[PDB]
Structures are given as structure tokens and as C-alpha cells.
């Protein structure tokens, strides 16, 4: 494993709303829950910014995280991400927030504590470009 | 390379519908074909769940797969994924199914055997969180 | 770091429109700018193909790149990608082009040189399948 610092920004996290955790030993992603005080209505085509109540600090520049829709919410309810895929840089230390976009024709309710996205830690490579007149092998 | 077990769930696979395979030695992804008996109409804004007739077993918890739209279908026809990006965990052993979403204003026909998404195997990192009051270096 | 060849296809690149570069030492992605001669209107639901004026040659088959929406453009303006996520293979040598899709209900102007997507280099694994009757450990 790799250690990632997490700062709890809302006292509900770790009490009434669990920290993110891997469901199984074989899970690639961590479900991300929303930290809100009352149910949030998401109308068809609406985008709403939803706080998680946590911040992470990846720190290692060879690692990033991506935030993806949940498969069931996306397929069944059209509850996806307004920016489609979120990218979390190694030096990002702000609260994780979810751009929740309803692409469906049905109104949707997000309840406090609901899982609405997933977080996946991936290795990344920082490239150095070499400007060339023609590509070579 | 890395060995990934594949189970054929539909006898058409490997006969009339090819197994997924890399197009070139430099390909990052594998096109995923649909295993259906007749053409499937996908109306504007419709989401349909399309079977592939295969299951995979990645097994290695340091590896995952993502399922992405094809670039031409997505750009030209608006034929993309209802959950935008699929994430396949290392311990997932069910049939691969595609959430096919038509985001365009044009009706689209999916024929038996058509490639409609691509599969990419990526390394993933399982993080262990350290809850901190303030981030440190 | 890893060296990636870049070919400049439009003389504006490196003069009036900067090469892609990492914003900070901890950045996972590189913003991609559009190489056009006049502002481009993107109507609600419209998809337009936007050139970058550069081509890259990753070459290493253990590496790929993905093209993602920018978080602010996607969340605030609904300016995302028509194929949702672009995948750049290691052997792709053509111009990088952005499928720019306006998923919002508001008209949007893309100016010459604007950043409208981001590029992330990721390791990829080329799998070899083993067709099995049942999965094993």
C-alpha cells in the first residue's frame, strides 16, 4: 500500500458518514460520500457541486487520483460527473468536491451520506517533451 | 505482458465475433464488441445495456481495467457510455456489459458484433489513509 | 521523467500559443490549448473538432495518454469531450485533436489559444488472455 494523508473537514465524517474505504481486497476504487445536511434534489440536466467533507494530500508526484461516476448510478439514473472525470493532482490539498450532473430525464434525490462517485489512485508519468522536426525510433 | 483469464459466456465469441485483441503492438486499448442476436436501435438520449459475451478475471489487485468510449463513435455519433467510464475491479468476475448511451440527436443502430467501447488495463494503487489534523511533508 | 517526442504542426505553437507544460512540480496533467485563427462558437449540444497544432509520439508501449475535460470548464460551463475521455496510443503520431462537446444550455466561445482539455500520461499494461472454462486462483 501507499500512505495518503486525509484531513477531516466536517465532524460528521468518521461518525455518521464513514471514511472512504476499499470494499474488498480486490477493489480498485473507493466510493466517495457526500457531506450535506439535508437531501439535495438534482433536476434533469442540473449540475450541483457536492462537498465530501474530506481533503487528501497525495504528495507523491508519481501518483494521482481520478474521480469517476458510479456504474449503477450512471447507467440506471444518469447520475454522473459534470466534468466527466475528475483529476486530483499530487499537490492538491483542497476539499474533494463532486460535480454531480444529472444527464437523465428523471429527478434524483441525493441523501446525506450517499455514495455518488468513486476515487481511484493511479500512477502517473511526468513527461519531458523533445521537440522534433520528424519522429524517430 | 500480464495474463488475464477470460471466460467465454456466449458460443458466438471466438467463432462469429472475435475475442478482444490489440490492434497493433503499440495499442493501449482493446475494442469491445457486443454479443447480440439482432441489430439494436439506440434512440437519442437512450441508454441500453449491451452484453459482450465474455467475463474477465484480472485477479492481481495492483491492476484494474477501464472501459472508455471509442473516439470516432463518441465524436461522430455521440455513442458513449452511460456511466461515462467503467471501472473493472481485480476481483470482478461477471460478464462485461456496456452501458451504451446515445448523447446525440440522431438515432443509431448497433449491429451484432460491433465494436462500441474499448478496454484498457491500468495499474492501480490501493491507498492507506492517515487521518491528520494538518498536512505535512 | 520520460521523454516524449513532440512535433509542432502550426507555427503559432511556441510563439503565440505555449507548448503544453506542467503547471507545478506536483501536476498530473498538462493543459491542452486550441490552435485556431478566430474565436469558435460552441452552441448548446454542439460537438466541434478542435486542433491543437501539435502531435506527440509516446513510442513506449507501456505508456499511454488520456485526454480529459478541464474541471472548471466541465463543471461551470459544461465544456467537455464528445468522446468523454480520449485515449492516445503509444504508436499514434497524428495531430492531437479535441472533440469539444458543449453539454450545457449556454453558448460558449473558445478563443484562440484557450486551454480546453488536459493530457495525462499513464502507464498501461498489455494483457495476454488465457481462455478458461472456469476462473482459478
Curated annotation (Swiss-Prot), chains A, B, C:
Its cofactor is Mg(2+). The gene is dut. Belongs to the dUTPase family. GO terms for molecular function: dUTP diphosphatase activity; magnesium ion binding. Keywords: Hydrolase, Magnesium, Metal-binding, Nucleotide metabolism. This enzyme is involved in nucleotide metabolism: it produces dUMP, the immediate precursor of thymidine nucleotides and it decreases the intracellular concentration of dUTP so that uracil cannot be incorporated into DNA. It holds the Pfam family dUTPase. Substrate binds at residues 70-72, 83, 87-89, 97. This is Deoxyuridine 5'-triphosphate nucleotidohydrolase. Its EC number is 3.6.1.23. It catalyses: dUTP + H2O = dUMP + diphosphate + H(+).
